[PDB]
Design a protein around this ligand. Sequence first.
Ligand SMILES: O=C(O)CCCC[C@@H]1SC[C@@H]2NC(=O)N[C@@H]21
Ligand SMILES: O=C(O)CCCC[C@@H]1SC[C@@H]2NC(=O)N[C@@H]21
Ligand SMILES: O=C(O)CCCC[C@@H]1SC[C@@H]2NC(=O)N[C@@H]21
Ligand SMILES: O=C(O)CCCC[C@@H]1SC[C@@H]2NC(=O)N[C@@H]21
Lengths: 121, 122, 121, 122
Amino acid sequence: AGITGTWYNQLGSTFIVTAGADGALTGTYESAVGNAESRYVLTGRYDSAPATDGSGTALGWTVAWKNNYRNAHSATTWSGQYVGGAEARINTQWLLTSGTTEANAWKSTLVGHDTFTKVKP
Amino acid sequence: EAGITGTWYNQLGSTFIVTAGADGALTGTYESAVGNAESRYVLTGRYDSAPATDGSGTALGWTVAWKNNYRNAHSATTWSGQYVGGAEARINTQWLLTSGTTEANAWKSTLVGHDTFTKVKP
Amino acid sequence: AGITGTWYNQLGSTFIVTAGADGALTGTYESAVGNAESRYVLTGRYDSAPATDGSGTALGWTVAWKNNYRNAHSATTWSGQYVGGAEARINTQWLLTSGTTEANAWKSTLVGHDTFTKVKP
Amino acid sequence: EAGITGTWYNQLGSTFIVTAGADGALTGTYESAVGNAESRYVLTGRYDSAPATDGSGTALGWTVAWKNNYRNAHSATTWSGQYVGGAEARINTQWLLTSGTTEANAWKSTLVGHDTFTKVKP
Ligand SMILES: O=C(O)CCCC[C@@H]1SC[C@@H]2NC(=O)N[C@@H]21
Ligand SMILES: O=C(O)CCCC[C@@H]1SC[C@@H]2NC(=O)N[C@@H]21
Ligand SMILES: O=C(O)CCCC[C@@H]1SC[C@@H]2NC(=O)N[C@@H]21
Ligand SMILES: O=C(O)CCCC[C@@H]1SC[C@@H]2NC(=O)N[C@@H]21
């Protein structure tokens, strides 16, 4: 029924988001893995007038991994598309950059892929 | 956050105007020199508002959806990277640009690259 | 029973490979999608003495998309790990670079992810 | 392929020694300036042996598994990119470095980055 809602990825992380009418994404993210506890703020953007040819809806969002419990000195961005229908899905690739010194910048950024559905594990 | 807040440019000639809020928010506008883009687009992101002080960069990211009130490319870019302060301040990034596609074309939906932003004295 | 064998990904592409004793990967790749027809040469490397703690076996390979039928002026590399067991798997991320002019180099490289099993679709 | 064949260096100070064969093969050795690496490692890859002549680069890629007869990091890097010829020849790449991990740690198995190689007059 749209991007707004509660989503879960293959790791069991929880992505709670609101899609504003003109393209904003606002919500919270809780990771099942990594140097993370509880909810973190997220903000992003999506295409609020997608094509009408069967294409997905492009979108992205960011989490900086600082909250009242922990600070991992890192940030993840997810870039992907929403695919509607009977089992809606958000398919993403992500980049997780840690703050590093300049000599260690070559090893600053992890890459991966997450797929989200509204099915609670 | 005075470091991040300001006007920046990348190696393509694109314009990144940003404000860093006390709460970790990034807000501003982006103008790409290339691609299916014209004029300014809204951006929004997050940064580490209490970064290490041990000679590490400050982790940050932001998103642009490539729709404005003049054009719509049906696509979105996210930049993930770090701010390196000082007199020659830089934001070093890698990015992912996803286009909306049909399911059959989803394998070719996402471009990857890297941008380096230089801050400009206001 | 090891890396050597015939593998298929989620697109239905066919990856036929031999793992040499000292780390070579040699074989052919046939893509189900894109500017591709029939088999293409591949070469790569793998860790020929993996850890003994339950970790996967790191590996990578390259295809340049030129054969006797077509030339797409492009190359893909896959980087990932082999995971043995009852349903062995190779989990990868890939980079597909097309030859471009310098002004268009920003849009030269696609990224994605392929998972391979020995199950024939 | 005289263009690609030779000795190259990247911005980290690493050494890439390669031979480009008539059949599209790349063979050689790689020496990283950084990471869990010492001495030379075998590489192997492929390139477009009949590239466009319209002012485009030549697509190529290669792999190093980080095991040699002195060290084993249980990891592998692939570089994907293009050769740009002429008097100031470059190979511009992006790379993926996958470490062997347990299944629980697989989400953090892969680093991404970018290297630019400069050819050195033999
Ligand atoms: O360890 C850190 O630096 C903070 C937590 C990172 C968790 C990552 S973000 C990408 C991937 N998807 C998830 O749901 N969790 C991991
Ligand atoms: O073509 C599109 O879909 C929209 C414009 C994309 C421009 C990209 S975003 C990554 C890179 N950095 C820039 O400043 N511009 C390009
Ligand atoms: O279109 C091209 O330039 C050549 C074919 C590319 C096919 C790509 S490689 C990554 C992905 N995995 C596949 O099995 N096929 C596509
Ligand atoms: O630490 C490891 O697992 C092995 C060494 C990895 C070195 C990486 S490969 C990408 C980048 N470019 C280089 O020349 N060195 C680093």
